[PDB]
Design a protein around this nucleic acid. Structure first.
Ligand SMILES: [Zn+2]
Lengths: 86, 135, 244
RNA sequence: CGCGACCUCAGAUCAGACGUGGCGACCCGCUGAAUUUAAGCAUAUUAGUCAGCGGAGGAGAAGAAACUAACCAGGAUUCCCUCAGUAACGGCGAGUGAACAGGGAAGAGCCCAGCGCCGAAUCCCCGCCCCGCGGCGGGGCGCGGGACAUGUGGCGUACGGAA
RNA sequence: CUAAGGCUAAAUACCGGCACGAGACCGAUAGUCAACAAGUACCGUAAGGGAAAGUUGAAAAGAACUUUGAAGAGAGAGUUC
RNA sequence: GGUGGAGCACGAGCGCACGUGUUAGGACCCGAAAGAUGGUGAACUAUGCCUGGGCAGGGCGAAGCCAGAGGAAACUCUGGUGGAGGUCCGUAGCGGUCCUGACGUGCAAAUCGGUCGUCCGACCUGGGUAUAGGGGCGAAAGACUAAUCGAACCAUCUAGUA
RNA sequence: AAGCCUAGGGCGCGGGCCCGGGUGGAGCCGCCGCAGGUGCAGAUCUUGGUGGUAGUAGCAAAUAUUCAAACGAGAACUUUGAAGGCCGAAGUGGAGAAGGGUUCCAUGUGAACAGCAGUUGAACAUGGGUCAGUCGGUCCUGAGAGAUGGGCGAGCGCCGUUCCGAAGGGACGGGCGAUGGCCUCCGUUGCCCUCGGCCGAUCGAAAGGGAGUCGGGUUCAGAUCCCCGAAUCCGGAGUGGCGG
RNA sequence: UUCUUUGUGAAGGGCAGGGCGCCCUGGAAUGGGUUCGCCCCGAGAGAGGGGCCCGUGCCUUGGAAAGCGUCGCGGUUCCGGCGGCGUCCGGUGAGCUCUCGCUGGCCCUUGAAAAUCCGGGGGAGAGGGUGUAAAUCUCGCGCCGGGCCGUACCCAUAUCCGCAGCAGGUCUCCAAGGUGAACAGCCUCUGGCAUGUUGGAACAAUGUAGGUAAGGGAAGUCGGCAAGCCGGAUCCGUAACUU
RNA sequence: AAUCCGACUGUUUAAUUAAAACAAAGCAUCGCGAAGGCCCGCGGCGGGUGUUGACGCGAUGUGAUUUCUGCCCAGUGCUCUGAAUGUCAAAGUGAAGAAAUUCAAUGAAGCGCGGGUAAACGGCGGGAGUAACUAUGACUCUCUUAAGGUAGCCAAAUGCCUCGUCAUCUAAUUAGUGACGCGCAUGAAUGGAUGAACGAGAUUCCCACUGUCCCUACCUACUAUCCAGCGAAACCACAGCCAAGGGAACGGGCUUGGCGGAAUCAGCGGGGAAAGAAGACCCUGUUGAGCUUGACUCUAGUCUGGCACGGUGAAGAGACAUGA
RNA sequence: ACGAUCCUUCUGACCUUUUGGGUUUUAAGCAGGAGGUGUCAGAAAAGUUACCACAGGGAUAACUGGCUUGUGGCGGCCAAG
RNA sequence: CGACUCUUAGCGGUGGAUCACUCGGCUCGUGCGUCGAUGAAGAACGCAGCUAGCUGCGAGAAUUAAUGUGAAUUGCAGGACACAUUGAUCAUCGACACUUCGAACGCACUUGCGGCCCCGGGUUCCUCCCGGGGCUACGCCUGUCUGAGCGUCGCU
RNA sequence: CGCGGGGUGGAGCAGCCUGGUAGCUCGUCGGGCUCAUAACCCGAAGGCGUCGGUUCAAAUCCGGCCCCCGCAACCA
């Protein structure tokens, strides 16, 4: 009765949506993540999984702030100046 | 010393690595005092430390810390070198005197290692096989 | 081999005490001026039953001689303690059943229980269900006292500690046998998970040093030395003799 | 039985700043094996390598001898060639294995404590005036405060230095 | 030579990122897993695993309109070399 | 005068390129039982704790109690009441003995039919929680640990060696 | 042009090669040397496609369907009416918790799925639908988890929940001073005197504790939630809004 | 004559009806009172008289206006209509379920914490002087507000987990009538459905699931395996052994 | 009506073994008075037992009741004391040398030595003499290593010979039951003998009962048959009629003969050395894994000694030395 | 009638080095002998698996089949009885 | 002749092999070499007239402002603009803005509870209530303030 | 490999640390005792593992060898 009849009593869950990595890996009982390690200050990463490092790296997401830094870098980091008006 | 952080036995392998009691930590204990001072106070930077007493169970050290952003050091030409971001956490990288002695670096035949950049760089040059264009 | 049982009891989390329904710790009063020089009077309000313990507890209420409150204590009831009986506590208190007073002061030969081992830790010795301690002799110099413990060993202790006079109520508990597995199952259910003891011979040899073989036999001397490691100190631990 | 200094130790939604985390190809400091070989295997080898931890930078580290040499002597550190698969290590087995010198790329030296001498001659912060302020600076005015004699600043560091 | 104090660019490394250049390299079962809405769909509770999938035509000019069938589907007609 | 040497006895090497053969490197290609490092799992199951829920109808008839009779007290019999049970038949529930039935590319990677054990306490079960791999847990079968257990799974060493 | 097909013509022992015809529409070949990821029949080879088996096994667990009408092009399976049945209140019923997440309701389609069919569906395309002081969560704590102090650890961090701790920021009354509204009064905040513990931050149950809503009606799909009508609980009130 | 229907919420008041280990008089053996059982009594029994709690039961405001069952009309309809009436009297039962209360038995099992609320001991303090105040664990009435999230549907032989519309598994509420000890099995009512991934035609073998067999009764088979016998209730009767 | 086992209720290998297995109340031990016993933890003034204190905690063996539990400490363990002292490391001390170095004394714990313990692991034989037939031995002596199986029990779940011998059960019994013991190799908490109740436990016999059979036969439902519709999968070098011969030692193909005729349907299990799975029974590998110990190296833990944290005072005592 | 490398021990030279020069102790060498590898051209090495696994082998057993018939069974020839 | 079966050829089906293309990868080389409490990386949720996915953007949400350029975007409608006007679209981008979680920062993650000030409705502060804004995390440096000590001292 | 100890009539124990007699039991030949047996008491054999030396003189104190076990030890 360890097979099909044992799959029927799977009602409660152990993991939910994490609020730092977004993946369904936040363990309810231990009150911790482990795709990213939410209660730990540092993001969980490991070098023995090279594919998992590139799944969520710097180049993956939106660059909602960093692409401006790259764009401002070639322009000279000027502030407070405006182009000469007509 | 340093007891090996493994359970009761559980040192699976060849009989060389079965020792856990009589193991000595490669870095000096005084450098550990510098390491812990900067770990707790990440805003300041350690210059050096010195010995102020010991017990059979404890060793006491006094570590000098420098405010990088205080205007007394920041405007002093002799001491504003530490304000540079190159010297960020010298205690972590073994740049103080207590950490410099643990690296085994120096001049002459007495060492014959650390002859590149550091001990790791000395191992690198002797192990990278140089293949030219023409060989 | 894997970790044997008993060795697993040191980590806990399955073998910890069931302290949910227990009503507190059975301790004496703390030392102060009134207890050291005179006596203080308490009232036994009611007697309760502590789960996992074979002795009833007497709920004794004292008044604090410093600030206006009533202090509730957890006294182990002596045999003969009833509700509303005045219980005295101190050096000047008289000698009767249910009256704690220092060991250096009563004449030797009394019957005391809930004996204090070190002066100021509120009673440790001879307080299980019906055991008691007897005093052999006193010593005015060095303030020592020889007291016979229920195990039969005589220990020379200080004369400044105290015990409550009498025997522990609830004697003869082991006189009636259990007669069932269920009454034994319910007995240790209040205490801890240690009742279903599987003998090590029938167990497989990876869980026990005595298991294995085609016959249910030990195969090795069951008397094991005192300095044996964990997982090997199993059986007769440093036995001086083995027979009758 | 208090007041007033000093030393140690606190509370601040005190005034003003600072660190956390990420990336991590290169680097630094630790910790750190077993596959594999030795036709087995335990020293050895894999290997101070994989993994784990911390730390920054655009480079890092190292760096101006408690050096190499025994020469008619060279002279910080870093990288290439060569020494060299050499001296040496190794159940002297498998295998491991540098360094000096020489030719080059580059080449830059210095600062403290102490010893001393100068009236603390020094430094930090708050208020006012002038200048420019979108990498908060320069000058002047303040019995305006603080740090400092349990030592700040100038001369001065082994190539001698000071008077 | 002068240790038990400290600073110091250059010759050095760079499979990450930005912007490029080049190729006796592979040409859609090859080349990065991914030439395409690819770390996407999907699988496992989770750590993680992880695809397949390029091509109308110069230009849609993508078949107006007649007829059978309810329609899918046809016969004609028409466009394009 | 004998003897050992990879020697001299009027050079023949250096550089480049190709082929053959050997060795080390993944080494002509594919293939293990293994070992180590770091992480993920008690939603199945194993056990403990906390908080809740449930377990028809009958059989036997313990203590205690009442009445009567017999007697010399001692006391003893008879008829009632009573409802005790790790009691019994038996339903729901829990589980799976036998037919080694059905099926056995099945309804199903373990189900179905009849016949079964128990069914008031060592009973069953929901939710929360704790114990994590040479570890846990085990009324003990090397059982269970997410269809995997005489050492789980995931990734790396690793294209491990043969 | 490449590529592909060929009952055509042939060459070379052979590896293979040259022409003829057809499709095709855009690049390709010979010689001298150079270089390689260079030649397949197998590896219980990998990927993809297709056969015999084969229109075969099969569409058989739980008693059962029949007649007439409607829609339509089409009816054994849809709907309606009638008959006969079954589940038999520990149900094939009426409602929930976990889980599912639009699957709930109306209209339309029948391209693909519902291992036959379907005018039908939990399929598809359009839209719509969940209304709370009183129902729950929110609050409390249990088993337990988990910071600060403390200790350990090379280290990410680990141990532990009262243990090596200056762990209260609260409150009554009085004094000093001030503002606020008709500084008479009340109110506000700062300091001083005074009092003071309680066992420790915090999390932890939609089945534990937990104040207080019921009746009728209403929608295609929501109703102790919307409307109607009756109540009830908590908090506030300075000038107290009124009476007793 | 057979079937359906025949009633009143929450919130308050009153009265039934239960419970008291609550009180006053009085003091009892010739012992008394009393339950299924118990049990109680000079530490106060009976007998009288009172007091308190639950009152979910009845009546009352709600509240007959509304709801329901019939009959007849209005609006073509679009309408939450308009009227006539009725919604009555009683008794039972070891009846089934729920709830309240009393009592008894068992434990080497004694059967949770906290938030929050309430009562009491005290008198630190307050107010007013002969018409008024401070007070009102708020006596009655009155005003304002109660903020955030879920609320649809399934909850299982088709909406969950098993690769699926899978005979598997999954925690709970209610439970009609008859027969019958029974919430057992069978039939019927309310409610639900089309027989469970299809139908038609024949009734071959071999099958799966049910049955029956003259005579023998285990001779079959490793083996009474399977199948079969008895079976409920009432009246008798009941052995060896034994803790 | 009996035999065996387990007392019993209960639990156990989810997915081949529900039991005689585990557990269980009872019985008998061992350690521990808290700076302790057992154990966890890399670590800490850490943690579980412990909100605990010998009627307790932790580790054991046996398995209800009744009765009994005999002998053996030689061996391996465990434990006790001990200057009665063989061995014994580091550190310290003395001597020699220019010094590294060497030698000597001292020399802890533990091993040895000496006691205890078998409800610790365990074991419980011969030989020889010996009673008025023989036989046998009530009795006496010896070892190997310490005694040599006591009470009881059985051809058992334990007996190779074996289907041991006798009685019963049957017409017939390698089965069962009841006795004998010489027992390859029964046996006393590795528990022996019993034993009321009970067991989805393992066997023998009797009554009733029946298709288990003699000996099969008939009926019903759903399949299987055909048809409407939809419709796979395993497997497949090629395919498929045999006798003999040889072959690689058993042919569908080769040879010699027999001979053979489209396409099929429903059964059927003779073959296709049928399919399902690189046999797990055996062996090899200088391939592993689990477990054990008297295997070889180690190690956690634990005991002992020294150094440092480690201060103060007073006596005594051992050696050396001075030395009559 | 007996034993390679490495290691150790001993013996010998007015023997070499002991790495800046000199002396001594010590140590490393050169040559010879010995301390042994009996698996004897020389690893340092106890068992069990019925809980087992992997790569293979018909180079190799446990069936049948194939050769032979020791043995078993069967049938003969001579003839002392 | 038939029906069935085999080979070959033509044609028509299943299938997407070969060939030629390629806004893509791999390798090497050069320059620079820049994250974040003024809130990084990442994640969640929203934003177009008709918008599912990709990309872009953040309640100013298919982009705002400015500079350069100069008649378009476009799948379909629409309407701005006169391109004789900073003017449609694009690139640059130096100004402004940037929801929630997240080192994540008032306490914990249920999106629930807090407190201290200011402002507007309540009110004409007199306390509730509502809405908006600014604060309230840890570690640590300098300085300030208030303190503690049978620490060392003087005054008394 | 270096610290120890012990070998004894036909058989089991001393005498050894300190040299002066090889002894004590048990088996054997006998003698006594009691009326006799039994028991008991007595006389007799037959021997310091081996070599050498110090010494008035050895089993004894010494050194070396054959047979054992106590330990601690281990790179051809
Ligand atoms: Zn996460």
């Amino acid at each position: 009765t360890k097979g099909t009849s044992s799959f029927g009593k799977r009602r409660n869950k152990t993991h939910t949506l994490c609020r730092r990595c977004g993946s369904k890996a936040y363990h309810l009982q231990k009150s911790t993540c482990g795709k990213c390690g939410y209660p730990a200050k540092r993001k969980r990463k490991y070098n023995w999984s090279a594919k998992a490092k590139r799944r969520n790296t710097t180049g993956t997401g939106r660059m909602r702030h960093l692409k401006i830094v790259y764009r401002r870098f070639r322009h000279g980091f000027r502030e407070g100046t405006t182009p000469k008006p007509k | 010393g340093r007891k090996r952080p493994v359970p009761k036995g559980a040192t699976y392998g060849k009989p060389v690595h079965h020792g856990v009691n009589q193991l000595k930590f490669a870095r000096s204990l005084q450098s550990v005092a510098e390491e812990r001072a900067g770990r707790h106070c990440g805003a300041l930077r350690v210059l050096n430390s010195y010995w102020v007493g010991e017990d059979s169970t404890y060793k006491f050290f006094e570590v000098i810390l420098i405010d990088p952003f205080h205007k007394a050091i920041r405007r002093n030409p002799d001491t504003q070198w530490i304000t540079k971001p190159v010297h960020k956490h010298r205690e972590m990288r073994g740049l103080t005197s207590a950490g410099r002695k643990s690296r085994g670096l120096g001049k002459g035949h007495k060492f014959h290692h650390t002859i590149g950049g550091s001990r790791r760089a000395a191992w690198r040059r002797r192990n990278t096989l140089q293949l030219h264009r023409y060989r | 081999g894997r970790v044997i049982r008993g060795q697993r009891k040191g980590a806990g989390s399955v073998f910890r005490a069931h302290v949910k329904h227990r009503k507190g710790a059975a301790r004496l009063r703390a030392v102060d001026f009134a207890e050291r020089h005179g006596y203080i009077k308490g009232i036994v309000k009611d007697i309760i039953h502590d789960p996992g313990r074979g002795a009833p507890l007497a709920k004794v209420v004292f008044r604090d001689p410093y600030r206006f409150k009533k202090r509730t204590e957890l006294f182990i009831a002596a045999e003969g303690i009833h509700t509303g009986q005045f219980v005295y506590c101190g050096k000047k208190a008289q000698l009767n059943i249910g009256n704690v007073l220092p060991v250096g002061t009563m004449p030797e030969g009394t019957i005391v229980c809930c004996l204090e081992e070190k002066p100021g830790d509120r009673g440790k010795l001879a307080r299980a269900s019906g055991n008691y301690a007897t005093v052999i002799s006193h010593n005015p110099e060095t303030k020592k006292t020889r007291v016979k413990l229920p195990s039969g060993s005589k220990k020379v202790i200080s004369s400044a500690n105290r015990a409550v006079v009498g025997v522990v109520a609830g004697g003869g508990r082991i006189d009636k046998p259990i007669l069932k597995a269920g009454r034994a199952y319910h007995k240790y259910k209040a205490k801890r998970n240690c009742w279903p003891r599987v003998r090590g011979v029938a167990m497989n040899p990876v869980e026990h040093p005595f298991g294995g073989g085609n016959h249910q036999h030990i195969g090795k001397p069951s008397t094991i030395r005192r300095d044996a490691p964990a997982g090997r100190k199993v059986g007769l631990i440093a036995a001086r003799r083995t027979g009758r």
